[model samples]
Structures are given as structure tokens and as C-alpha cells.
Target: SIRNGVQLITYADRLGDGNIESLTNLLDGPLKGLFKGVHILPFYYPYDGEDAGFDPIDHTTVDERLGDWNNIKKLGESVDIMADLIVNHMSGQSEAFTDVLKKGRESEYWPLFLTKEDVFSGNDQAEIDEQIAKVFRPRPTPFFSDYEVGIETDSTETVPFWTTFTSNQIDIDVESELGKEYLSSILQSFTESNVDLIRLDAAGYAIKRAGSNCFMLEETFEFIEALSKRARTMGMQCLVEIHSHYQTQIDIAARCDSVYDFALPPLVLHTLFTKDASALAHWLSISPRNCFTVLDTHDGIGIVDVGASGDKPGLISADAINALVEQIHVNSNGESKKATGAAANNVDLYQVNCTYYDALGKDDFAYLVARAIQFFSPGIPQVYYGGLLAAHNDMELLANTNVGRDINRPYLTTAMVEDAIQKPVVKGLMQLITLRNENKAFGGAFDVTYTDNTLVLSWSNDGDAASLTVDFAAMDATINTVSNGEESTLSIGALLAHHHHH
Candidate 1:
């Protein structure tokens, strides 16, 4: 439903203190027309959780601190709104999980959860290792957790439960009827509450079977298809969020409405860090047309996007990824070190936490270049909240919360937002988004060229055309548009001049 537009990706509370109402005020007040749709990050009950809000206690209920479903509907009325389904797991503290812990197998919701026996019933240590090796796991915390669940009134035993993300985020038996019914009810509430899109968070880890990699297998596609079909029936679009090899993303796009371009983040950063657009050019050649493009998200800059270089093996090589990651660390002056890897109490093994701006050494031009490439790339472009304001790494939050991804999720106040956008980079981003949103040329065929370490991205529909030319050395961009029949070029100077009157 996107006609070449920019979507705003933000957290409900981080934008302001009052939640969605404040966000609407800003959209209707100062930030009107900049965002075509809003992808508000998880606003679930007990939202202020260990993984922030990702590990929700209740997916259906909006955090009272962030207001209720009515306010969610109000926000959605102003502009299209997207919310997370969090289909992966629920909190261990959830009623279902607690009930499972109290009532054990006797609990009606017992089948709703996955257990060690369910996954590795008769396997020994070596067999268990072999089986675990076959499955892809995101956390290092051993996929199973030991829970001392009580069976009878006076009897108790420690049950090993499958906890993919965290002990708190108990994995659900997605195959079970209870899980299916529970998820359907959530989808129904979200649709009724005015969520236009359902972002399947941690979707790849939903299905687990013996003798399989347990990530995005054939059954995973089946689930994605079924889930998308169900979501569509309820008038909601499904956006699958998976950070895997590039081919997996392409395959998922064939079945789903949208997939996140996680590869673009690292690849675009590589293009800016090194003045070569060769990799980027190759990627845009076969990149998914039905995808949402991103430079930065609520999480870290993804490393898993471009796993290793091969015939169709992701966008860049393994060494290239390692080198770019190191460069980001070096450029940030070791600040990224404080917020990433083993130092930052993070369970993730792939992503490195650092604000996109800081990762580029806070170069305003480089930041805009990354953003311009994001807009020019195929699919709908989404600007994360911190990136929109050109925010730096919030090491304070990272250190305080000890969560690495917190680096990109700095809380913004009304005053901070008003001041932040006044910066040149933020202004340039807004200008770029405005151009991307208004131009109809992006509604059709696309072509990209790389020459002299500079890149030119072009899009054409009917007779209208738009092209963005970027210079890696100069770290500047020029957006040229052919509307109806007239040709106009937008440079940084033009953008500054255009916004100067405001």
C-alpha cells in the first residue's frame, strides 16, 4: 500500500513522556508529512521489561503507562500504524507460564509451551550436542532453562523448558492448538485496536523440530504463509523480521508482504566507510522489491545480514563484515566497545550495538549519505527514531541498563526532539524523507550504477523519474527528480534553503 513513502520507526514512550498522544501531537504539529506511516515499537503490558518491551507479558493489552487500545486507535487514525505480534514467546511471569509452573502438565496451557523433552526427548550428551548443533539458536544461554515446576499439591520437580531468547521469554509451542488460539486472539485484538501491520518479531525461531536447523526451514515458510494469510484476513499486513543470510530474506519475501532489508545496514555502512559501491550495486540488482529498507532499527547494526560472500551468499564477505565492524568500533573511538559485544550484557551474538551516526564517526554528511542510499534502495524506507534525530550512542543508558541495543534507543523529550532536528544532519534527513515520500518516480522500475567510487540510484515510473547520486569521498548526495516532464535537482544547499524559511 506504500506509494514510495517514508515510514517512521519509533518507540511509543521514547518519543515523549505521554506516549502515542504526544507522538500524534508532534506529527500533527511540527513533524507533519515527514512520515507516511508509523511503526511503533512494542508497547505491551509490563513494557519496561528486561529486553525492554520485546518480552511482553500481554501482547493484546497496551501498557497503561502508554495509555490503552483507544489511544492506539487514535494514533492509528492520524496515520497508518504498525505494531509487533511478538509471536515468538511470552514472559515466564505470564499467567500461562506461571500456571504451567504451578499446575505442571495438568495445566490446560501446558501444551502451549515447548520443553526439553519435546525437543530432545531421548538424546544423550553427544546426541544432544549433535541435535543442538543442527538447530540455529540466537542466544548463548542454552535453549532450555530449568524450571522447578510443581506437579501435585505437595510435589515439585525441575522441568527443562525451551527458552530460546531468555528464561523470561519462554518459547511457545507454536504447533499446539492452545498456542494457535492464543495467537489468533492476539491478532484479533490488534486488528480491532487499529494496528494496520503486524511485525512478526523473532519469527524465524517459532518452529523447532528434530533433525532440522530450527531456523527458517520449510515448516518456517509454512508458518509464515499461514500467519500472513490469517493476518490478511483480519485486514492486517505481515512484515517478517528475520536476520539471516540474504537468500532466506528473498525466499521469505515471495511468501510475505514485507521483509526487513537487514543487509542494507551493514552494506550501506561499508559503502560509506570504504568509498566503493560495488557491493551495494550488486545487492540492489537482486534485492527484494517487497521489503522495508532500513539503515538503523531499534536494535543494533546487524552483522548476520551479510554472512559470507558467495554466488548468492549474502551481500558481502565474512572478512569484510569483520573489518567493517572493527572500523565502526575504531571510528566510534572505542565508545562502541562499551555498548557492544561481551561488555554490554547482551545475549545476541551477531549484532554490534552503536548508533548509526556514531558508527560513522558522527560525520553529518556520511549520515545523510547512508540515509539517502536507504531511501534510494528498493522497497519502502524506514527511519528509526534515533537516526531521524541524528542521535549519538546513549552509552549512559547502555551502562545503566546493561543492554547493548539501548545504544540506539535513547529516550527523546519534546525539548530534545525540537533541538535535535535543528541539526543539519537531522534537517537533511527530513528533506530526503520528504523527497522520497512525494516523488512518484519511485513507484516503478529501478536501476543502480557505480562509477569512480560514486553511486547513482535511479527509479522510473511511466515518464517520471528520480535519481540519487552519492559521492563516498565527498560524503554528499544530490537527489534529482523528473516529475511529469520537468527535471529538478535537490542538493544539501537547496534543502537548507528550503527549510531555512521554516
Candidate 2:
């Protein structure tokens, strides 16, 4: 089983000197003992692909630029490791996909990829249009990409293959035998490399049916359950990655080993920005217990997770969500506005692209308080690499690539990391991590209470007790810890104070 403590979610190359060895060294060196697990973002066969390694040309092998599986095994020796399975799609450049284009129906891999005809009958144009319209879309782009097939034959045929994210990423036919074989082979590789957990990336879009929306349907849940059982048999747990309605998160958590608490990011921001804890408190009361809570991630802070589903009310009111998003634009000095939505490419309609630090206007105290709330929440907390260092928006990377997510995905060299850790806010966060990890209270019963202006969360087991009380109106937080009948009340100021001994 995975540890109950904090996990560091980062890209190996972006975190330090662009290799697993250096990332392992940093974890053991300056960041030693701060994290019990490390969720390394996609480091598959091609790390620098169209989607920053999410579009894998080959999912079964390690990207040669980042060493190999031995390095991953070595890292696993220290901390629990989690890797992305990318369940929905693969690169259009994969051997199987290219072969399908060459041989058409004759290729052994032809059924491995999904095509328009598989789900829709083009004979009836009106019915086919309705069915395609019903398919849940993550972006505004067309669902299928045009391709020339039957290159080895006398004549060529133009086919439309499913491409959910981009033309470079072709959707996989998971219901097919070849697709099952492909996924199982990758799982076998991860089993050999000591990958403790598999995150089903873009899992919500893994299943497709004739009439339904083709996202998180009843069949999709069945698929996740079966896949998770397979991972459990392989001595690995599964974490489903999906950003959707709050109820969907709760449902996914019940079936899978874990799910991301994506709503926490926007809720935390709302609490700080509005000085009201009502929405956040309501969410905590009903939030999933088996979760990986986060304040920031490789992608932007997701708004759709807390927003409403069709005919269902959202956690926060639609008007409130609008104001919250506008407030983020104000806090980041309009930098986020430039990178989010239509201003940049590869933008998620549901997320606002900005570092969590800058989203809070670079206020160290508020950021630490947010981290405290996450640590105190009822799940394992995973800190993003940039969040760990209190990083700012990388507008340069956004300008260079025109990718909205790149605004928050900055590269940190070893020297940059070393300097970042010495900062007061970073040190404070590390201290909170240590306290959260070592404290026995976190493993016991959890309780939460809140009013309009304040929120208090406490945990106790036997003699160990820990509590975090925050006054949102005053922007103050206090952490009271009890260990072995002894008690200490630590203020945010005291936590941020420099320690000469270290």
C-alpha cells in the first residue's frame, strides 16, 4: 500500500537537470524525507512530444533522454512511485498507427485504433451527426482527423480516425483485443520497474458507446474497475485522473483506489479571495476519503470539477464561479488571462492557467495556509513541484510555445531548486509536510468545523492531536500540535521564521 503522507508530483526533467538520477538525488539530498511518494509525470518513450510526453509514441519504453527503467527502479527504492498510463490515446506516429495507415484493413493493428465508422454509420447523415454531437468533447476541435490509408494498395482511401486531444494523438480502441493486449503489455513493464501506482490519465474518455456521451458512462466505470483489479493483482494500486462534476469524483473514488481532489484548488482560492468558508466547508463534509488532494498540478487549476453538471447544481454558484475566475485574473495581474481560454493554444475550457502562488497574488502566508488546509484535509496531499517552490507564472514559456499549460510548467535547475528551498515560504511548507507525515493524528479520525469567516480542522488518535484553525477574515492561521501529552501552538509567523541551526 502507498504511504499516508505527502507526495511530490513533478516532471523529472523539468524539476532539475533533466534526468531521473538528478531528481532522485534532489529527493534524497535537500528534499530528503519530506515526501513519502513521488508521482513522476509522463516520462515515456517521447517526453517532448506535442503534449509534453502525454502523447506517447511508445508507451512501453522509457524515454532514452531520461535514462531507463533501471533509474525508475532505483528511485522506487527510496520513495513510492506513480506513473501515468495514458489510458485514452497514443501518438499518431506509433508503429501500430502508421502500420494501420499503410495496410488499412489488412494490418494486424488496424483494430487497435478507433475510427468514425466504428461508432457511427455514415450512411444516415442526420443520425450520424446527432450521435457525433452527443459525444462529450474536451475541446472545440473536430473529433476526427483525416488520414490517407491503403498506401500499399492500388488506390487510397481517406479515413477519419478519432483524435480526442489533437491530430497528433490517436484514440485507442480499448474494447478491442489488440487494445487490451497493448494495455496489459505496458502494465507488465510497469510491474517490472516497481511502479507502485498507475494513474489512469484521461480515463474519463477511455470508453465509447453507440448512443451515450462516451465519457464516464456506466460502461466506463466497469472498464476502470476491471483495469484497477488487474493492477491490484500486479501489486500496484490505481488512481483515476478525471476533471469533471463533483459527484463524478465521489463515484470514481468509490470504485478506484484513489481520485484527485481537484476542487480543492479553486475552493481554496475562493476561501482566501472572498473571506468565506461556506462552500469549502460544505465540500469537505462530502469530499471523498480515498483521494490525492492537491492545490496545484502539471495542468492549470480546474474549475469544471466544482462547476455544475447538466441539470445539477454546482458546489459553488455559477455567478460565484465567474467572480472567482475573474479574481484570479486580477490576482495574476492579467497574465493568466493572456494564457487561458482563447488567448493561447491547447487551453482547457474549464481551467485557468496560472501558478498557484501567483493566483494568490504571491502572498506567502496565504499560500502556506492553503497548504496547511490541504494537509489537514481527509486524504493524502500531493504537492506540485512549482507549488513546492512557490513559483510564479512562466509567461516566457507560454509565449514561446503558445501552450496555456506551459504558463505553470516551469523548468527548475538544481541551483534554482536549492535557492528555492532556502526561501522562508518553501521551508515553511516543508516543515508542514514533515509535521503532517510524522504526526499520528493524521492517521486517526478526522473532523471539520467552519463558519462563514473561519474554519477549523482537527485530528486525534489516542494521545496524539493536531489542529489547524484559520481566520479567513484576518488572513491568519494557527497550527496546534499535541505529542505525548506535550502541546505547542505554532503561528504562521513562527513557522516562517528562519532557523539558524539548519
Candidate 3:
């Protein structure tokens, strides 16, 4: 099992000189003991890939630019390390993929990737067209990317390969022998390097079928369970990544070691923006307990996670969700609107591209209140590096790359991190993390209750207790604690003082 304390999710290059050693120094020196685990975003070979290391050309080798496995092992010794498995696809530039492109059917590695013929076929063109209509798509781009293959002299064949996220990311046929072996080798490498947990990135779209949406199907669940079991045997737990309906999240939780509490981010935004706690409170009552709770991540704040799926009712009404998206755009002063959807490249139709702080209009008190709720909520909380410092959206980076999510993916130098931590808002967050990490109450029974615009969440264990009360109408929160027959309230100054005096 992984540590229950707070986890930090960040890319190695995005923080401290774009190297693992700098991140290690930051964790050991300034951010010491604040996090029990760090979800180091994709550090594989070619970290600067099409998807910022998610598209690994070589899964086993660590990019020498970010040090090597020894650095990973050293980091793991101090805090648990969670790495991305990138389950769905690998880089199109991978040697195997290049060989498949060159040799076509004769290539020994041809079975490693999925082809149109692998999943869809029919007696005629009409039947094939009908089958394609049922396929679910996550992006606005075409489902398949055409690649020409010349297996014989004066002869060329065009093959449509399944490219889920981007044309550069070739989908793996997990059912094939080579595909299974390929994923297994990556797991074995992770186990040898002391990876405690594996985040199954894009696992929702791993399996495909002719008659279904080809996403999160029954077979997908089975694949996840089997892979999770395989990882567990190697002493690593799995965290399935899915941004879907609320019920789907609940269902996936039972099969995997953990699932992301993606709904909380939007729900929290709703509460803060509308001063309504009913939706947030209802979700907390039924949300998954064995999960990683987050307000922001490497990608944008997700909206589809809490929205209605087809005819099913959602945690929030469709109108409310629309308003929520608009509110985020308004809060960021239109910066998010500029980066989201058709306005930017690499757009995710289901997400709003903006930083959490900017999503809340850089309001320190409101942002801190969001953090307080997250720490008190049931599950391990993973704080994005930007959220850790209450960083704003990086318009410059977004303008340079034109990638919408880049608005939230800022590169912070060691000096910038050192400076940001000195701010009151950042100090307040450190206090919450410290409390979440050291407080015995967090490792106990959890309950939530709300009245009108005020929400109260509590945790208690063996006479130790912690409670957070947020009244959205007034836009304020109070964190109270009782330990060993003494009761007191926690504040930014108090948490900082205790942490220092200790």
C-alpha cells in the first residue's frame, strides 16, 4: 500500500531546472516531509515528446536529461513514487512503429499496434461505415491516421491506424501477444526501479470493439483488473485514470486499486462560484473513498467527469455545468476561453483549460478554502505543483505552444519556487498539507454535512479529531482540531509557526 499523506503531481522538467536531481533537492530541502508520495509525470525516454513524455518512444529507458533509474530509486527511498504507465499508446516514432510502417504485414512487430482491420470489418463498405458510426471519439480529430506502406516493389497500401490522442501516438493492441509483452516489460522495469504506484493514463480508451463506444467497455474493466493484479504481484498498486460520468467512476473504483476523484474539482468550483453546497455535499456522501482526490492536474480541470451521460441525470444540471464553464472563463478574465476548445491546439472538448488559481480569479482565501476541503475529504489528496503555489495561468507559455493545457503547465525555477513558498497563500497551503500529513484524525472515520451555503466535513480517530467548516455565502472557512483533550483552531500563522518551532 502507498502512504496516505498528500502527494505532489508534477513533471520533472516543469520544476527546478528540468531535472530529477533538482526536484529531489526541492523535496528534500524546502518541501521536506510535506508529501509522502510524488506522482512524477512521465519521465521515460524522450520526455519532450508530442505529449510531454506521455508518448514514450522507449518505455524502459529514463531520459538521460532527467538522470536515470538510480535517481528514481533515490527519490523512492524518501517518498513513494507514482509513475505513469501510458497504457493506451506509445510514440509513433518508436522503433517498433517505424518498423511496422516500413515492413507492413511482414514486420515481426506488426502485431504491436492496432489497425482498422483489427477492430472493424464487414461484407461491404456500407456495413463498415455502420460499424464506424458506433465508435466513440474523445477529440474532434479523425479517429484514424492513414499511413502508407510499401511491402512490395511498385505496390503501396494505405493502412488506417488507431490514433486515440494524436497521430503521433499509435494505439497498442493489448489483446495481442506482443502488446501484452510490451506492457509487461514496462511494468517489470517500474518494479525494478521501486515504482510504488502506477497511474494508468488513458486506460479508459484502451479496449475497442466493433459494436460499442470502444471506451470503458466490460472488457476494459477486465483488462484493468488483470493488469492491476499483475502490478500488485510486483508490489505496485494501480490508479485508473478515467474522466467519465459519476456512476462510471464508482464502478471503476471496485475493480482497480484506486480511481481519480475528478468530480471534486468541478464540484468545488460550483460551490465557490455559486455559493451552493448541496451538490458538493451530495457528491462527498457517495464519491469513491479509495482514490486520489485532486483539484487540478497536468491537464485542465475536467467537466465531463460530473456532467450527465446521455439520458442519465448528473451531479449537476446541464445548465449549471454550462454556467460553471462560463464562470471559469470569466474568473480567468477570458484567458481560459482563449485557450479552451477551438481557440487552441490539443484541445480537450471535455475540459476547461485554466489554472485552478486563475479559475478562481486568483482569490487567495477562496483557493485556500478549496484546499482545506480537499484535505478533509476522504482519500489521498494529490496537489498539482501549480496549485501548491497558487500559480496563475501562464499566458506566455500558452501563446508560445498554443496547447490549451499549457496554460496550467508552467515551468517553475528553483528560485521561483523558493519565492512562491514565502507568499501567505502558499504558506496556508503548506499548513493544510502539514496537517493532512501529520494529523492522526485524517487516517480515520470521515463524515460530511451541510446546511444551506455552509458545509462541514470531519474526521476522527481514537479521540483525535479534525473538522473544516466552509460557509460559501460568506466566502470563509474555519479549520478546528481536538487532540488529547485539548482543542484549538488552526490558522495560516499557527500552522507555519508550529512547523517551524518543531
User: Candidate 3 on 1-502: residue-level lDDT in tens?
Assistant: 7787999999998988789999999998778878999999989898996678877888878999999999998889868899989888878888888887778777789888998999876668788778778887777776889988655425668999999888888999998999889999989988888889999988888899988888889999999988899999999999998778899889889767899999899999988888888999999999889999999999988887888778877898878888888888889999998888752222124889999999999987788788888889999999999889888899999999988889999999999999998887787788788888877898889999998777899999988899998866765578889886889786534544454555
For model 2, the superposed segments whose C-alpha errors exceed 4 Å read: 153-158, 342-349, 498-502
Q: Candidates ranked by lDDT, best first?
A: 2, 3, 1
lDDT tens readout by residue for model 1, 443-484: 888899988767899998888899998876775678889885
Best by lDDT: 2
Which of the two candidates, 2 or 3, achieves a greater TM-score against the reference?
2
Model 1, which residues run further than 4 Å from truth?
117-133, 146-158, 309-314, 342-349, 471-476, 493-502
* TM-score computed on alpha carbons, candidate 3: 0.92
Q: Give the residue spans of candidate 3 off by over 4 A.
A: 140-142, 146-158, 342-349, 473-476, 491-502
- Specify the poorest-scoring 10-residue window by lDDT in model 1: 340-349
RMSD of each: 3.2, 2.6, 3.2
